[model samples]
Target: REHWATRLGLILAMAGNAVGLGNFLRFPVQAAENGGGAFMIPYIIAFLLVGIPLMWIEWAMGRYGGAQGHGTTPAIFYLLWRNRFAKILGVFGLWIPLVVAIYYVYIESWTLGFAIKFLVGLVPEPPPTDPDSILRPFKEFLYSYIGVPKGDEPILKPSLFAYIVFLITMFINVSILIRGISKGIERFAKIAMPTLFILAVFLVIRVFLLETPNGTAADGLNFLWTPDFEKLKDPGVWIAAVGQIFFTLSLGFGAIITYASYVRKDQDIVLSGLTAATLNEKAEVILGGSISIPAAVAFFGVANAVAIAKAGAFNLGFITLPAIFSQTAGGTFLGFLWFFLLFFAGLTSSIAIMQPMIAFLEDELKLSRKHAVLWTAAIVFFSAHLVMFLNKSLDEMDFWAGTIGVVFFGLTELIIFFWIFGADKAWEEINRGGIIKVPRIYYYVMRYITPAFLAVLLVVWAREYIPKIMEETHWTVWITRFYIIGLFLFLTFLVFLAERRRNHESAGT
Candidate 1:
């Protein structure tokens, strides 16, 4: 039931999930939007300092869990508290990936829609006429046909078609998952991941050779590679970099733990996680950022990159990149390539997200693999479709899913690693099978520094959730704020119940 293809397959599948849609779609856009080239400084620093260590900790904990034959949350926390605090954060761990899949499924649906559009050549014609006119009509068509609102609406509605696409994508994911690990997950990544990379590099090559009317072949590359440190002072830059770290890699979630749960007893937990994180950042920052965005700039120019830079993390992937892809030489092919890559990336990561819940069902409930897949897939699929209703609710569901869901999961993850599970155990896991020693300073940072850091960051981010924060934006903000809080409290209560059930099961009174 728990078999992996080989050591390589488990590693690749984990990395594939960790490296997903965010790599192709989100990270480059976030970097370009924040400070373009300048964003890499803080991003690289964060990856090295915080990302690597946390990943190793999760891996070690997972390895410990797997060696003992356990699921992700229960595996990690139960190792620490036995039954006492096990379900407290474990419930959150189980739901984090589930919640992510809800929104993630919808977004992946967008990729499927666009990939189809690319194959059909569905976009408006590019321009030898006035560039603005060519761009304007296509932009209008994108929102008009797709049901996405034009500039400053703060939320876009997905059509009925979009929801079906999401479900179909979910069906595809679960179908593969049902096939079990090696046959389903690893087999896909062995081919898809490398193909995705080739497409990305191929696009980068196109940007360098194709010049605009002015014959400026290198124009976009200059904007992307040329660093402007002045933008580093911007708070948006730092936050964007930080946000990308959390969002792009699926960090602070049980993803790493689930993947490492498959690793053999003697596998190097700490070293593998570190290597994966480093490789992940390289793909996002260096290759995805330095190459992909600059390539976009070469075809489009500073004007588009400026809009993306200003859009920061949130709009960069969904909104800005669509426009950038519209202007590229093979914008249609490139867009197809971009979104198809995202489709596979999202799929790779989807396996990791789905596996944890499936594992928990099998382990705790003693369900068969087929039964676990069927039941868990049903729940997650319906829950993912729940977001489609948010379109009618004026983006309230999105605010909850995006800002609140992310912060809540991050806080829960930190508390589990730092307080419930001892930092020493986490550090020990980091050293297990790891070539890296994780200096004494790593424990101090994991225990003390990161928690305090995320606490403040969460609060700053939560401002959008407070009704008072929305007073300036008319009542739209106020409405969304209340909706976010309500959704959060609802999830909190569910977790509360789960924790209580766990307690009763443990005491056996």
Candidate 2:
């Protein structure tokens, strides 16, 4: 069986997997915009009530599946429930990562490109804001740099720099992933995770210590931490908090399940899972919380800072922060540090995202490791290229695979693990090889509260977002939906075929 080289390596890799752009770019913005200090009340509550339990559950499911000699969720689900629909439900584990990795790597490539630009002092200056135009100057720079065609231009004429960086990012993921888990992914994580933290820590110190142009450090902290009690009454704040926790921990991504499937059976997953979750929270809440919003408040003041964050995820990282870096002392070097920090965070996640499909090919299809990795890489490269060229498709896929699909899978897994498989058995699976015991109350939480909570989330999103997506009559929307549906069908067929083959081989033996 494949196993982590060491426990520490496993934990760090898990932490590295969880800590991504969401931690740095999305979390702080969500915190400040949702309810500031009031957000933390729901956020922490969600973490304990939802995030930690889900972490333990996914880890438990993965290890259980691994013990049954399966890596992807279809086979894992089949092993657990002995039902065909369970396998169908499990296909989301494969589909979500495969779909997400396509567009996610494209975004990841931007960080690498920006980092290179910063190092060379080629970072674009943020254009002055226009009152009439919806697009900020930084966004305009992004469009120009990405070569988003306006008229008469080729459909896919990305800037040479953008294309090169995208290729480079794909190559990095392929090369590392082709090396197998312990030697490649874990080794990279051990190095990159520490470096990522060091860079973040350095920036946190610098950004906080340096004088802001407007707000004081205390004011910045207050902006993040100051609770509006009335906002707590709004369900929107709680939902935002829940969403942040869900996305930031990389839950329902199938990456966690794939990673855990590689563990040695006797390993202490309970403690390790909690530790990795805690590490990611530190990166998100403490480090992520400290850097972007605080610095923005100081430089841009509270109002502009809020506007910058509200502008979008990229605005804060690629636009607003870069602008700040350019104006500050040692701005260029700091810019390099900032973008590289993002790059490392993204690279680790891209690697994790690739693993589930590779594992599916290798374990289920009996493909050689090299063959599986190469096939997965080829699939991701072409799909990501399509997303790069077709603009709106990215947003469409991001909504389904990144947001809605995650919640769907998370809710499904919760039901199968806690209810269908029997909570008692699932709890026992979690208890196996543990240095720490899961609280008895969480067993009930896992069975009842977690599922009820997840159902509410699913309903809220469906009521709020589904109608908006359906109302869009664009060809791009249809294309994205078609692609997602086609991919799901293909993945399900492959798993079914693999299962048939496994049964045949077993009968022959």
Candidate 3:
């Protein structure tokens, strides 16, 4: 059985998995755009009510599934509910990680490309005159690298740098995955997580001391942390908080469940899982919250910060932050540090995304580790190219797979674990080797509050998504739906086939 090399390794690996681009790059921007400190109020509340309970739930699910010798959700669900349909629904567990990782790896590759550029001084230096002067070149560089049309560039030209960087990223993930859990993922996490922290601390110190021509670092902090009560009345702000918590914690993606499956039955998951969540939260709220938005606000003021936030998360991370770093005292050194920080942050999370499906192929389909890793790598490679080359494909997948699929599966799992699997048994599973006793109140939260929150999120998301469809042309909408639906059906078909194959072999034996 594959297991973590040590308890520390396990916790760090889990933390590494959770601490991704979202924590550092996505969170602060989200907070700034959503009402700064007012966002934090809902964010913390969501963390307590939804994120924390959900963490325990996924940990318990993974450990429970692991003990049954099932590493993926399909068999895990089957084991829990003793129904064929449970296995079918488990396809979402596989599909969400698989699809999200595909496009995500493409995004991850950009960090690598940017890091190398900064290290080599290949990227443009910050203009010395205007604090906001860096935006133009950075925007062009971003659009150029992503194959988007910028200014006079008519045709979408593929970037050789982007392609090479993507290949390098995939190669790393494949190499780590081939090593299995203890030697591969855990080892990488132990080293990478610490390095990430060091880089984050270094960047944080630099960012904190930054004195922009426009405003001080404190302005940025105020922009991020100051509560705007009016925005709180908008339901969108609350939903944004819920979404941030979900994405930042890496919940509903099935990676946590796969990682926890490797823990020993008697291992203290209650404390371990909480420790992992704590590490990720620090990386998100403290480190992530401080760096990008603060620096942007310090130099550009709250208005430009809001504008950058609207431009997209990548704009803030890849475009704005790099632009800011170029203008700093030791711009090159700081740019290298910033991009490399993102590279590590992305690398850890991307590796976790690949592991769940790799484990699925190995554990359920009876593929050898080498074959499983290669097969999954092939799928990601092809799918990533499509996202990288095409326009709006990444956004479409992000909307359907990343957001919708994650919340849907999370809601389903919550219902299955608490309502169908029996709360008594679920509680027993949680406490099996718990070092820190979970309070009795959580049973009710998991049973009632969490699901209600998820239901509301789903409704909110649908309400938002439905209007966009109404606005788009039928041809565009159908094509997008076809792409998403086709992927889902293909994965579901594979799950059905694997189950049948296993059943046939069992009968013959």
Candidate 4:
């Protein structure tokens, strides 16, 4: 395995995966929609119980797998526990990341396009005189940018420029990927993460400085902090809180596990994982939480902000925030900073997402770094079209891989590592060459509490999304399901083939 260049690089890269558009866009949305400050109670609880444990498990498993000459999860799982089902289980690690990358790249592309539009002055300036609705003009821009189906238009379609930006984004991602981990991913994160932090700080200050109609920035902060305690009893609120944790920390994504594969075996992942998680939490609550909803309420008033937030992160990030920025005194520069910051978030994340499959090809299939990267890029580029052109297919894919698959896979991983691999052994592995010891309470949580937490979240997820699946009959949706299944089967074949080859080499007739 090619070890990360420095501990800082690995930590930053790990935090880069954890902190993305979700921190700024998704977290505040979830917090607002799921009961305002009430959401943080469960949110922080989930982080302590589910989030922290999974980080350690993924980090330890990856380092252990790397020492055993395995990096891709298929091989990693087989190493963890030698069973017929084990390697097949590892398929989720590949499938989920690859599946997410398809639409994710395009979303990242949108950020870049918006950033450029701001920089180039294509976006309309705020009217010199106040308008009744600031949301109106920017709403039209988002509609045009993404080609939202309007009057006489039958279905959603993107504009031509969005396509070009996506191509450019893909080109940038593909270029950096070919450089290998230490040189490419680690090097990029070292710069991007620090700069991203500074930009976030600058943006937060700007948002806080703005004047409000009904209340102070303090009132906006109150909206975030004031708990709707009655809402906490609802299972859906807790579910959303846990889901936000998963989304915010990249907990269930297999991205971290793969990133950790490049770590030196005795490099103290215990402290490293905690440090990475600390960085992510700091970004989410401090930087992200401070800006997103606070800015919305401060500008639009509390009721309007909450209503917009309930719509989802896309609307809030793209439409609402753009609208808010346009109304700002220095609208143009603010838009540039906002989307450019998200551009770095998505770019770094996409780089991390691509690594697991690239590792699979190079490590298991014996391809060179360039060969692995090119193959992965080709397959992803060809497959990404399904998301780009297929209208609601992007949403469908995200629900499955980005949302459901992550939790299910993470749950299964926890079971395999702690239960199947032997909890005592798993405990020892976590402490292997660690700079600090995990608290005894955390050990119990990893063994008992976290698994229980995931199992309940898994049921909530099923109860919610299964109905959407059962009623779905659209051709494009069916095609996407088939496409995902096809990809999974293809990965299964490769896993079996790699296993067969390894066994034969071991035997030598």
Q: What is the lDDT of residue 186 in candidate 2?
A: 94
The CA root-mean-square deviation of candidate 3, after full C-alpha superposition on the true structure, stands at 1.9
- Tens digits of per-residue lDDT for model 1 on 31-91? 6665556877777766655576567667776777777777667546767676645655566
In candidate 4, list every pair of residues with a backbone clash. Answer: none
Q: List the residue pairs that clash in candidate 2.
A: none
After superposition, candidate 2 runs with Cα above 4 Å error: 125-139, 149-157
Candidate 1: 10-residue stretch with minimal lDDT = 390-399
**What TM-score number comes out for model 1?**
0.83
lDDT of 3 at 22: 88
Global lDDT of each model?
0.65, 0.85, 0.84, 0.84
Clashes of each: 6, 0, 0, 0
**Which consecutive 10 residues in model 3 have the weakest lDDT in total?**
149-158
**lDDT score at residue 127, model 1, on the 0-100 scale:** 57
Q: What lDDT score is found at residue 476 in candidate 4?
A: 64
Q: Write the per-residue lDDT of candidate 3 for residues 327-425, one digit (tens) a residue.
A: 766787788888899889999999888888888887888889899899999988987766775566677777777877787888898888888999889
10 residues in a row with least lDDT, candidate 4: 124-133
Error of 2 at 331 (Å): 0.5
